[PDB]
Every structure is written in structure tokens, then in C-alpha cells.
Amino acid sequence: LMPYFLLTQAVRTGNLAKFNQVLDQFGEKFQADGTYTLIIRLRHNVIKTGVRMISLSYSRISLADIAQKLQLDSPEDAEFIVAKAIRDGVIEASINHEKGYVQSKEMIDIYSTREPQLAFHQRISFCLDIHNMSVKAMRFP
Amino acid sequence: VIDAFRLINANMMVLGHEPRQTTSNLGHLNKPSIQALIHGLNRHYYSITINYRKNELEQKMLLNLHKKSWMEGLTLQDYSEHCKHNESVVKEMLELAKNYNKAVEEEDKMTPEQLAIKNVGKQDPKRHLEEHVDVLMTSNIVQCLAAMLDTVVFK
Amino acid sequence: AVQKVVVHPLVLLSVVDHFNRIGKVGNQKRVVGVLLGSWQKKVLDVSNSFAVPFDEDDKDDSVWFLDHDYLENMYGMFKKVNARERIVGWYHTGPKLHKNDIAINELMKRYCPNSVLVIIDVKPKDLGLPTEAYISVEEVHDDGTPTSKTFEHVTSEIGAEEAEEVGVEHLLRDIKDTTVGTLSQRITNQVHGLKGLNSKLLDIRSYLEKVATGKLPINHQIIYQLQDVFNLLPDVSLQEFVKAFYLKTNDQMVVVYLASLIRSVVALHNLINNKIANRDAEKKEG
Amino acid sequence: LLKLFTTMELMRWSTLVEDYGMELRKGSLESPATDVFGSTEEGEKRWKDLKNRVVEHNIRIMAKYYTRITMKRMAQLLDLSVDESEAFLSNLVVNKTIFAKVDRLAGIINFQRPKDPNNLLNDWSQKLNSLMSLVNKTTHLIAKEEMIHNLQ
Amino acid sequence: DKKFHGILDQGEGVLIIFDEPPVDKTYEAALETIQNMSKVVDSLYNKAKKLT
Amino acid sequence: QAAELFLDTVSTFTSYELMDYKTFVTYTVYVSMIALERPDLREKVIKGAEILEVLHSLPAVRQYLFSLYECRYSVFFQSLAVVEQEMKKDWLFAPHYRYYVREMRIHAYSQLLESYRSLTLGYMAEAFGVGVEFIDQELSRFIAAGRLHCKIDKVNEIVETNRPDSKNWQYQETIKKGDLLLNRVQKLSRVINM
Amino acid sequence: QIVGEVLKQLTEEKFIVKATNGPRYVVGCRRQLDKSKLKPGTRVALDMTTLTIMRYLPREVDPLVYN
Amino acid sequence: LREELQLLQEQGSYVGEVVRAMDKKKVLVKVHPEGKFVVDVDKNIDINDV
Amino acid sequence: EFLHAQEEVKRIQSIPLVIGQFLEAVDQNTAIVGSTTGSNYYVRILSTIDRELLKPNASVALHKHSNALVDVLPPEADSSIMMLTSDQKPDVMYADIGGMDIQKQEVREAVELPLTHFELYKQIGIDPPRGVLMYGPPGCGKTMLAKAVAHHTTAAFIRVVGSEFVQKYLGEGPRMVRDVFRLAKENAPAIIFIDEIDAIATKRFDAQTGADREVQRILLELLNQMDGFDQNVNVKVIMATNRADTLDPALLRPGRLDRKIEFPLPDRRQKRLIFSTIT
Amino acid sequence: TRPANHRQLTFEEIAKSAKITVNEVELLVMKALSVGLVKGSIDEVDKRVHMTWVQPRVLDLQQIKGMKDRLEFWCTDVKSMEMLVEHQAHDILT
């Protein structure tokens, strides 16, 4: 996990050369585990992960600023990346071809207080199977 | 209590006493009171069994009409006293939190039933059972369903 | 003149039995007597009943007879045994009311100034109504309408007599008409509540339809004065749900966290305790 | 008195000085009126005391009628400018007479207390029970009038 | 020091005053019940009886 | 846990154990500063007469403690750096990159931006030191860390905070704890049926 | 109806009442006896059978001294 | 438990301080409200059990 | 059907109950309660309520016609009034008293136990005093130290009032001592202050006259409660008396109360100090 | 006619209904509140008047079909939702 820790730091930072070196150093075990094809995929999706974190960080971030932050050096590539992030639905960052506007959040609506209970009311479903297992597992002799 | 008996003359006792005749019906649920036993009444002859004329056109009339709750099941009562009731419910179950806490560190390794009998506390697992929590849960959902049912009626 | 009346669960069955016992030879379908009780705080209550044989003829509804001397002797005996009891009104069966009621009310009002009429449905049990109350108001039908009888219904609610709970519980002892089985009982409470709402509102819709057809006289002067507000009251605006998006949904989600989870945890605790006991018993049995 | 006491009329004192201001110039006796308003120094002080008195009266009656009123209209109704209207509006609220909240940048006011969701659903339930009672009363009324109307 | 109820919107040069509803203490009380009824029981009991 | 059992000013010796009573106080001040920003700490440590006396003994220690209490960031950051430098010369240096100055300013920035909605980066920079870019990069780093509940409008250089209501923030806490306990009960569901 | 003095109010519906001679009982107003106006030390009428207070009563005036 | 409540409607059991245990299944007993009350002995306890 | 039956049997009257003070829970399903009129009879304890509020000698609630244990009242002070929690209220702080000291060093010695120091009572091997009797006239106030001290170190203060205690409530006199002791035991920072002992409460030179035996029994139970205290917690008990000659030796003997303090007349130099403080 | 269906009584709608000027709307709605025609909130940013009536009058009994249709609409909605919740509750009521 020490190179994995450095991989996590590289993912957060967004740099490329540093982790490419350590992959060349200790990437053989990753090949043995069978994730080296994914490892390269993370190496080139590091910018995607950085965009999500910085998009969660900022309200209206400049397309030039995000390009400089994640080493894009191109306004068009930055516009494409945020285009590719919104179409994946991972983040809510939108595009305004004027300067790159992104909407903010809003107050809590009808279903925003109800989506936890809707996704968590399976508690009784666990309760019923626990009771049913007890039904199966209370043999007296 | 509606107990009926008969006074007897002196001849019934000198003959075969217990004037209760030869049958196995008045011996059903025949428990005369201790003060009745030491008095002659309810002891001289017998205790009379009681029955109620629960005939139909009379009993169906009583149950249908007297105990009347027919459109009163549509009450909503979302938070008339329930916001503070939920505050009390949380506080009571916070006490259950401490009680169900107290239990998990008792939890001794000597057949905990042995510990439980001599250290009863009437905690959430023992006496303040899940049924009380069910009562709180039923109260919440009933107000929920009533409010939601009328919400979709509101069209 | 009374604001409202409240009927006890004390006289309804007595009237029905009186109908049954005097209907053996009198098949007029018309049972007429007096209801006795008390009126203290604009709330009228009935505590005793009595039936008198009573015959009718359809000719102008003016053929009848009663036993007034016996009925008056009953009232004196009832007042002697219980002073607070007084004749609060006179009752007649046969909800299809005829025209002799005005003559009966005029004769009996010497016992009660605000004479009232009561109809008991011995055989009918339509939805839950045991009886209906009637107040005599002939002080002009309306502002611009001709003269009429216009016997109106003073609001009636079934009261809660004391010391009869013991008897009724012992009597039935089979249905248990209480909130017992809270979840299932409230489901039944929701069921017949919807049944009552659907039946009564359908009756109101039928009345509006029949008013539209005009086959019956239209009492619109009170119908629209009472139903217009009912219709226009803004219970359909959903923006107050928008303002109260968390009307209680916060309490809904805590109950999910703190009733369903708690039930799951305590059930889980019971099972794992049983599983430990069963595993130990299996391993240490021999 | 009949005009200026009740029914929440717009007490535009500019109109009142000629509609009901005749007591200043000539009335039946006009001797108390000249003592009150016909005086020079104390009369003009009482004139100003009538001028404001109708302003709080106009604010108070507007409170129970209009929830949100634009700043220009309220100032015109108070016969003053924006700053003078807001100054008196501040004078009422510091006395707890009215429940008023103003957005000074937007120049918009509100007089309704924010309805807590607890009591908001309570009045909804009370509205529901009022409807339920109306159903019961209408059902008894129509069914019995149905019984009278089919006695044929 | 929580003596006032508002937020200072310097961008608009204003301060938005909001009437905070304090009846929402059920929220925090519920969380405390969650914390002191679950953490103290599930970890301790089911780590002691790891084998079942 | 440190502070709750360490504000007790009952020393076994007048000047021993932790090298002094003055060093005992400096540990108290550092631990308290990591602990909390500004609740009624005026009635917890400031009301402490022995506390006020020892800050009279140490003016520099009194300087930043009052600077945090007065929320004057112009002197706070300079004094906060001096605090970090002093902690460097101390063997109790374990929070070398977590809780010297970053955690305290996280409390300070949270204290500052709360009761605010949109405070400009340029003016908050001069009110909190100098180097508008330095504060801008500091805010971006700390927002990425997770705290400082706000967002930056870079195209207009504004700090638009997002403070949840008492209902909203607390409801967020419940759904987080709901996530943890669902993870717990699922683990317990694994414990059963095996 | 037996007469006592309510020592204290157990709950909103439970009231601890001392019989002037015998033991303290507790009673409870049924529906409309205005439990708010009842105070610790008030005078109420009780019945060993009806289980409740049927009506409330003010105080005394030292009659021998009064006349 | 309901039957226990109905039994306790008759005060249930009465506390007595046993003093003298006579041979003919008789114990004098002392009761706080009144005092001595000579009575028989229950079936579950013998004469010597007193 | 059986969930319905289980919800059917739980009626238990659900009706206005009564109070007969509980004596002690002998076992489960068996109990001994004492009704207020005496009539101590054994009852059956339901499983609904138990040790969670079933403290040995606290006032409890019982069915009206059944007298069965249903509920227990937590509060004990308001059962017979006799003052209540005078804590959390500065009436006369401490140094603002005009009486200066008289001694006030044995009183500060008395407040040492409320002022923690019970841990310092051990280790150091001291046996701290438990009962302080002040056999002084109304000079120095004789309650300005009890109204203070309770606020100097935050502690509950109860007036008790001995004259009120001796009344028809002689049967519940033992019960009220148990209740007030439980209130004291509930709050370790508390002090019991009893007044007017000399004239009425268990005078020893004058023969018993009617209800005097009842007063002696009440003192006997108060002695029982103070012996049951046995330094379990840090509560303190102080009686204020004008003359301790008539007091019973049971309280006067060491081992129950030891510290005797006399508060003399205004002490002219102190009297001028009292006037200056009051003025 | 509109049971809160159109609860936005804008100035233009008021102008259509009463052919009155803008300044007279304030007096007209004032007298409406006094008599009892409309008792709802009166705004001016959007000029919205909330709709409550407590003084009913003749509803043109020849046009009773409108209220009959609305009432039967309520009947259909209530019965449909009652059947829907019954469908969701066959696992308890059946």
C-alpha cells in the first residue's frame, strides 16, 4: 500500500510523471494482480477525478483555472473535460461558453428529506428475515 | 357482580344437603365469595348461573350503533401535539438507549439469565420491549398515511 | 332553542325493545312514546324511555290515541325515584315522518317547552345511525319563502354514559370495539372511514344531481350557503407543502432510523442469542 | 367620526383637510376646532399630530389587509417619501404594534409571521375536520329533506 | 456569539436576517440517541461474541 | 479528551513534572486552541483567574490567545506562525502537518465565514493578512480538505458560503450516521447466518 | 361525597388528595372538572365509588368565630 | 394478573405478625389495623411450618 | 388473535390511582405497601413498574379500589411541602453577613464535605463531622449560615421546620423523613436545616403528653434515617436550636452528631458591625 | 366557479373582471374584505389575492352542473385512492 498511498496522492494532486515512474518501478505486482490495464486507466483518469473534487470545491471555477490546476494548458480541452464530466452525471458542473458558469446547490425539497428513509426503510426487511431465521432455528430437542 | 341464590328451610339441610341437583353445569365457574360461604345465602341452596339475552336485532343493534366511530377514522393530526410528542419519544428512547447500553456491559459470561434474574432493571430488551417502540412507530406511520392519503385526495 | 343534543348509549336499546314488545299485536309500524332526561348547559341528554301503543290512519294523519294518564303516572314515578330526570322530548319510529307530529308536539309540549322529536330505526342500521333528533321551528321558513312546517335536525352525538362500560364490555366480549391491535385496528379505522366518506359524499352528489333534474323541491337557500364554502375552501393548494416539504418527513426518517432499525437490532440480538444457545447445546449435549 | 373610526378607510389627510376639514374654517361653532388646529404654534403642532396620527392609522389598517405592498405605493399612501415612510415603519415596530419585516435593498415588506410546519399542518387538519363536520351536517340535512320531498 | 440571527452578504453589501426555528432540536436529540444506543452495543457485544 | 482532563490547575508540585507550571499552561493553551474556537470559552478558560495571571506572565502567549478571542486575523496569523515555530522547538510536535495552524485556522475561517454569505476574497485577504493569492490558494486547499463549508466564484472572486440550517446540517449528520450503522448492521448480518 | 384536600397534583389527570381524617387517596377529573383551577390544597368532593371528583368547593370561615 | 388484581380488590393478603402457633392448626397473628385474629393454617404449610 | 389478546388483557383499569407508600420489594410478584391510614397489607407487584423507580422508601401510587403498585412519584419534597430546593438562588451569599464569624470556622469545617474534600477526608485519615447542632438564640440569625454556605458552595437548602412537622401527619412523619432524606441523597450537594426543635420536638424533661410519644417515634425514624445515611454520600445535616438541654440524647450523642456551636448575643463590637453591614 | 383552481387574482385578471383602474383595486379589495367577499392575502409585488369566501349567495341553480361535476370529481378521486391503497394493502386486508 505504500506505492498505493503514493498513487492516492497522485490521484488527489493530478500530477503524471511522479506516479508513472513508480509504476515503472513497482508495477509488476500490479500486473500480477491483473489491474495494470486499470492502473493505466487511473493514470489517465486522474484528471477526471481531480475535476470532480475541484468542481465540488468551487462554485463557478474558470475553465482556464481548472486547466492550469490539472495540467491541461488548453481552454478547449478544459471545456471538453467538463463537458465529459456532466454527461457522465458524476458532477453537476455545467458549461456556459461565455466564461464557464456552474450552478450551485439549493435548499431541501420534497424528496431530499425522504430519499434517506426511502433507501433505508429496508430495516424491517432485515428484521423479518432475522425473525424467519429464528423461526427456522428454534428446534427444541 | 350479579349473584342470585335462594333461601332454604331447615329441612333441606337435614336431608341430602347441597341442594345443587345432579348435573355438571352449575359447577362451571362456581366460585362463591368467602363472605357468601359463611353466610347462608349462596350456601343454603346454590348459586344461580347468569346469562345475557344477546339476541340479534338487539345485540347487532348495540354493536353497530352504540359504539359509533364511522367517519372519525379520517383524522389527520399531523403535529397537533406530535412535535413535542416526538421530543418526548426521543427522550424516552434515549433512556432506552442508556438502558440497552447498561445491558450490553452487564452481559456477563455466567449464563446471563443468572445475572438477569437477580439484576432485573426492566430495560428496553426486558420489559420496555419492542412493542412500545412499535406503538411509537405505528403512531408515526398512521399520521403519515392519513396526511398522505388526504394529500392525494387534495385534487 | 337548544344549541345541540347528545344521546346516551342508555336509551337506544330500551326504545328498540319497547318497539319489539309492543309490536307483537300493534303492527302499525308506528311506535310513539316519550324520552326523558336532562338539559343543563345547552346539551340535552336522554336517560329513560317509554312506549305507548299508537295507531294511525293515512286520512290527513289525524287518527290516533294514547294513554296519557298512565304516561303521566310514569313521569311522576320516574321523577319520584330520580328528580333530575325530566321529559326532554317525545319519540316516534317510522323515519318516513307523517303529519300528526305537529299535533303530538302541541299536546306534549306542556311537559317540555322546547319540544323535540326523536326517530329510532329499530330495524334499519344504515351506516351507524341509531337515532335522529328533530327540533320544531315554524318561525317563517325563510326571508322570501312561504310558510311551512320545517322540522329541522338539531345536531346529535352519541354520548358516554358512566358505569355502562362494564356492562357493554361483558355483553359483547367478542368484538372488542377498541384501539386494540393498534396497527390493524387503525387500518380498519381507515377502511370504514373511507367507506363512510365515500357513501355520504356520493349521497351529496346524488342530491346535487336530483336537484339539477328538479324532480324534488330544492332547498337551495341552505344547500349552497353551506356547500359553497365547503367547495371553495383552499385545501388544494400544494405550495404550503412546498413551504413544509419537511412537514414531518424528518420525523418519518428518524422513525426509520429509530423504530425499524431498533426492531431489526433487537430481533438480531434475540437470534444471535438463540444461535449461541443452540450451538452450545448441540456441541455440549454429549 | 363615522368616516375616521372604522372600516379601515384610506385616511389621506390631504383629502381629509377639505372633505372633513371644514371645522378649521367654519362650522356650527368652530370654537374648539380653532383652539385645537386654528392656533398658530400649538395649532401647527396639533396639525402635525393629526398628520402623523393618520399615518400610523394608515399603516395599521394596511397591516391587516395587505401582506406585501411596494415601497412607492406605501409612501404615496402615507403622503411621504421612502425614507420618511421607513422611519415611521421603524417607529411602529420598535413599539411592537405591528409584525413587519422589510428588505431595505429591495424595498419590500411582509406582515405575516412565518408559519411553523407544526401548526401549519394543524390548521390543515382543523380545515379537514371542518370539512368532515360539514359533510356530516350536509348529509343529515339533504337526506332528511329528501325524506320530506318524497312524502308523495 | 449567537446573539443575533443573520448572515452578512458582503457581496450585496447587506446582511440577510433569518428567523431561525429552534423547534428542530428533535434532530440533534435523535442523533444523540443513535450514537449512544448503537455504538456502545454493536461493537462491544459482537466483538466479544465473534464466534457464533 | 486531553483538555477535558487537563484544565485542572491542581499541580502535584509548584514547578515540576512538565518542566514548569508555565510550560503546564502553554500545553493548556495549545490543547484548548486545538479544542474549540469561540463558544462560551470566555466562561471556561478566560474566566480562569490563574489563566489570566499566567498570560500576564507570558505576553506573547497572551497575544495570540486574545487575538483568537478577538478574531483579529491581522495579528492572529503572524502570532499563529510564531506558535507553530514554538511547537517546532517542542517534542510534542506530533501534528506536524495536521493540527499546528491548519486546524486552528479551519476553526477561525469557519468562525469568520459563518454569519457571512459572500465575503470578497480581496477584502478578506487584507482583513486576514496579505497576499490575496495566498488566501485564495489556502481556501482552495482547505475546501478540498473538507472543511470551510463554502464555494469560490472564481470568475467574480467571491466566497459564496453554504451553511446548512440547523435542520439541514443536523439531517446531514443523521444520514451519515445512518450510513455508518447500516454498514454496522450489514456486518452484523454477516455475523449471523454462518 | 367524601371531602378531602388535594395535597399535590400527581399528573395532569392525577391528584393527590388527603381525606380530612383518613388516608391520602388520588382521584382524577373525568372530562370537564377544570383541572387547571384545582390547586394543591384545594377542596374537592370525592366518592369511594364514582372514583372521581364530581364538583369542587372553596374553603371555610371559622363558623363559631363567624357568628 | 387480572385475577390477582381482582383478588387484591379484597385487599389480597393481610400482613400478620405470627406469635402463637397452636397445635390444632391455629395461629393468633397480629394485624396492624386491628391486632390479634385467631385463624386456621393454610394447606401448603403444616402446623410445625409456622 | 393472541396479539389481540395480549393487547386485550392490558387494561388494568387505566383509571385514577391512589397513594399508599411502598415499604420494600420483598420479592417479585410479592410486595408490602403501607397505605396512608396505616393498614399495612401485602400486595402483588405488577411487572410494569420495578426497580427503575422502586426505591425502598419513596412514596408510590396504587390503584384506587385495588391499592396495587402502578406508579412511583420521583419528587419527594412537595409531598408535604416543608420547603424545597433553595439552591441556585443567591439570597445571602456569604461574606455579606453582618455576623462576621461568631465562629464560622466550624461552619466552614461543616461545608468542607459539601466543598468536595471527601477524597481528602480519606487518605489524610480524618473522620469528617456529620452532624452540626447550633444551640444558639436567634442571635446571628442562625439561618444566615444555612441560607449562605448552600450558595457559597452550590448546595440544596431545606427549612424542614420542626413545628410544622409535629401535626396529624405523624404516621407519614417517618415517610416524609424518608422522602426528604431521599431528596438529600439525590443531590450530594445538599444540607438539611431543621428549626424549632427545643420547644416542641422531643423535649426530655417534661413527661409525654398525648401526641408526645408520636413525636418521639418521629425522632426515632429520623435517627434511623441518619444512621442509614452512614456517610454514604456528601450530604450534610444541621439542626438549629435555642436550647439543646431538652434534646434527646440519641441525636446529642457522638456518632450521630458531634459539632455543637453556640451563637451568642450581638456582641456589641460585632453588633456595631452588624448594623454597619445591614445599613 | 374556481375552488382555488385559479388562486392568482392578478391586476390584469381584476381588470378583466371589473374593468377598473389600478388605484381603485386597493379600495375594492378593501371593501371586499370588509363585507366578506374575499378574505385572503393581498400582495402588490405580483398583485395576488388569496381566495376565501365566507358569504355565500345564489349560485344559479340552473348552473349547478358545475358544482355537481366538481363534487363527482372529488368522489372519483377519493374512491380511486381508496382502491389504490387497498391494492397496496391486500397483503394485510386479504
Ligand SMILES: Nc1ncnc2c1ncn2[C@@H]1O[C@H](COP(=O)(O)OP(=O)(O)O)[C@@H](O)[C@H]1O
Ligand atoms: N446580615 C445579617 N446578619 C445577621 N442576621 C441577619 C442578617 N440579615 C438578616 N438577618 C436576620 O436573621 C434572622 C433569622 O431569624 P430566624 O431564622 O427566625 O432565627 P432562628 O434561625 O434562630 O430561628 C432574620 O429574621 C433576619 O432578619
